[PDB]
Design a protein around this ligand. Structure first.
Ligand SMILES: Cc1c(C)n(Cc2ccc(-c3ccccc3C(=O)O)cc2)c2ccc(C(=O)N[C@@H](C)c3ccc([N+](=O)[O-])cc3)cc12
Ligand SMILES: Cc1c(C)n(Cc2ccc(-c3ccccc3C(=O)O)cc2)c2ccc(C(=O)N[C@@H](C)c3ccc([N+](=O)[O-])cc3)cc12
Lengths: 257, 260
């Protein structure tokens, strides 16, 4: 193995083709090492409006919090399809029982979305609209209850996770590992899922020992970050359908997932 | 390797202090459950319970069971404190952070070790002298009937990993040194110790079990299930507090639940 490297390469390539905005580009934009385009900054309501007028977002279908929230829903639905297409390229995935494919995606897309979301975040805000914009953290937190603490856990997590300084080639395999979780509810055949995940974990371990030679504890710290991820999801659910306080039907049908 | 040797030394140290801290190990529990040790008297209904009191172990069943769990929880906290102090670096931390780490760690550790006393049919009681069935515990009047069931649910899943005491020692050490506890002052020393503990556990599982990295991942993942049952427990506790007002909660446990 000899194969963990091949698998790493394949997953990296697939990752590049599946996700338009990589962490490398995102960091280039956030630091400003290339500029080349400073992102349109949204820090309050007027800049939000002006941004809506300039960029003309595709999800604009009339209250700030609601609009931001629905933008998040739209981007999330795009992300799900990107992640699905990436999942299909994981060696062995399409050979799994179709039910299990659907289950794995259904229960993994959240964790993966937050993982990749960390790539678009620093301690001060998040890249928005394909990287064309940047929304401040303070503006997100200043939204009315309950939307005030919607984005915050993702920011906490993103800070602590970005402290690990993973690059795209690490993240590809990390995401692959997350997808192939054998403890999703309602799985019919766990064995191949965990065999594949075993191979993926080995690939990840090697990839980390090679890409990050200075640190021997990174693997354990990452695997530990997975649980952080899952509880971020757990808490997010609790905050999520507590937003059934809201109100249409066809749109809600699009986002009923 | 040298680093490997360090990790092994840490593992042996932790297992040693684990054996010295906890009088009821998983090895003894399994020796009792699977017929070296005496066989337990089994309580599975009211009659066998009343006989069980004489065989031997205000008297309302659900309440008395609740209080028993409480007593054993106080003892467990004392044992866990003693163990925590044996973890290298712990006693050198800020005192407030020691208190915080214990405060948020004891529940997760207690349920972790409780799994060792459980099978899908029930749980050892009275230092392994007894065995109370899962269904008898479910049959307790509301709301005490739902007290133990989540712990059983977790216990089955967790026991499926087939860990032994030498694994558990490092795992609970990892749990204690959690850097994401609310209200910590110095996170970095804590996470520094925990990283070492995580490496020690990874190597331990590597030497003691197959597909060790996957086992490592699953085990680490169990902490989600753990925090889940802690949450459910606290909620049930709120209910009980409201409907059973003549009931004492031990001051120590109160300190633990205060502004959790
Ligand atoms: C995929 C994704 C992105 C790109 N962002 C940042 C973002 C995206 C869009 C905008 C934005 C805002 C206003 C105007 C334009 C834009 C813009 O950038 O286009 C800002 C930041 C997210 C923020 C949160 C979540 C999330 O917590 N949960 C998902 C699974 C979910 C999300 C929602 C629900 N839900 O309750 O329906 C369930 C799960 C997901 C995402
Ligand atoms: C430490 C512990 C043990 C050994 N058992 C099994 C047991 C223990 C005692 C008995 C028993 C029953 C009757 C007579 C004698 C015994 C006996 O063996 O001694 C049977 C099984 C437990 C069961 C539940 C909990 C729990 O859910 N939460 C803790 C933090 C807690 C537990 C309780 C409370 N509380 O509010 O009371 C707060 C937190 C903890 C424990």
């Amino acid at each position: 193995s000899a194969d963990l490297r091949a698998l790493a390469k394949h997953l990296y390539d697939s990752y590049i083709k599946s996700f338009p905005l990589t962490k490398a580009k995102a960091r280039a934009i956030l630091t400003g090492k290339t500029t080349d385009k400073s992102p349109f900054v949204i820090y309050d309501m007027n800049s939000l409006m002006m941004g809506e007028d300039k960029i003309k977002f595709k999800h604009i279908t009339k209250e700030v919090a609601i609009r931001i929230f629905q933008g998040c829903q739209f981007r999330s639905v795009e992300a799900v399809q990107e992640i699905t297409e990436y999942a299909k390229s994981i060696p062995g995935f399409v050979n799994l029982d179709l039910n299990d494919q659907v289950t794995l995606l259904k229960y993994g897309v959240h964790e993966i979305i937050y993982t990749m979301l960390a790539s678009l975040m620093n301690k001060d805000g998040v890249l928005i609209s394909e990287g064309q914009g940047f929304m401040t953290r303070e503006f997100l937190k200043s939204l009315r209850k309950p939307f005030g603490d919607f984005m915050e856990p993702k920011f906490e997590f993103a800070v602590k996770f970005n402290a690990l300084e993973l690059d795209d080639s690490d993240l590809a395999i990390f995401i692959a590992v997350i997808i192939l979780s054998g403890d999703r509810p309602g799985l019919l055949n766990v064995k191949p899922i965990e065999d594949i995940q075993d191979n993926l974990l080995q690939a990840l371990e090697l990839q980390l020992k090679l890409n990050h030679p200075e640190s021997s504890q990174l693997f354990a710290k990452l695997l530990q970050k997975m649980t952080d991820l899952r509880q971020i999801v757990t808490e997010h659910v609790q905050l999520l359908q507590v937003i059934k306080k809201t109100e249409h039907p066809l749109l809600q049908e699009i986002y009923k997932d």
